[PDB]
């Protein structure tokens, strides 16, 4: 597998459905726990197995520990490199916000893409991945947002 952003497609009798997305970096595939639930993944006839997960952060990696290294800081803009069902990839620039939750305070972007985009990378200006789209968390105000940072 080469480094990059990938769609995750599930086969059924009508053909494939895109259930999410993820990032391959340094030998490891990164996606959301809610997308695969730990299921084995295939790429061009090669199997990859789950290696680590954090259900509370909605994260799972395959073939190694977490490799994503971006860290977002308040005020900085990022890009969601969205891979939506039925759409070519699109970069959308946005400024994440800080939100209060019961657990603490998080950085988050708005849930402005298909739920099938879950796993797409959110990148900083250095091209590093600061988080993955689609970790839905509830704020104190009763909003759902897509968390990127604690």
């Amino acid at each position: 597998l080469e480094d990059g952003a990938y769609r995750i497609k599930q086969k059924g009798i009508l053909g494939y459905s895109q259930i999410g997305a993820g990032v391959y970096k340094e030998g490891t595939f990164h996606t959301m726990w809610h997308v695969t639930r730990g299921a084995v993944l295939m790429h061009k006839g090669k199997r990859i197995e789950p290696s680590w997960a954090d259900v509370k952060k909605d994260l799972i990696s395959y073939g190694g520990g977490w490799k994503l290294e971006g860290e977002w800081k308040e005020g900085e803009e990022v890009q969601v490199l969205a891979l939506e069902p039925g759409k070519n990839p699109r970069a959308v620039q946005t400024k994440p916000g800080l939100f209060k939750t019961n657990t603490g305070t998080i950085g988050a972007v708005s849930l402005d893409f298909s739920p099938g985009t879950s796993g797409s990378p959110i990148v900083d200006k250095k091209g590093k991945v600061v988080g993955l789209y689609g970790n839905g968390v509830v704020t104190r105000s009763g909003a759902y947002v897509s968390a990127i940072a604690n």
């Binding site: 480094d3 086969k11 295939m42 990839p89 091209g127």
Partner: protein, 46 residues
């Protein structure tokens, strides 16, 4: 149990991971994808 996988989940590469200069300029930009790919068909793997 079964020695077959429960579900056939397949990966398909779609984009380089990078900051897109056009999106910094305009706020949003399509990421040129490849021949040039004019439309994503969800039902086909690649």
């Amino acid at each position: 149990g079964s020695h077959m996988l429960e579900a056939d989940l397949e990966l398909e590469r779609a984009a380089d991971v990078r900051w897109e200069e056009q999106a910094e300029i305009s706020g949003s930009s399509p990421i040129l994808s490849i021949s040039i790919k004019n439309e994503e068909e969800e039902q086909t793997l690649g």
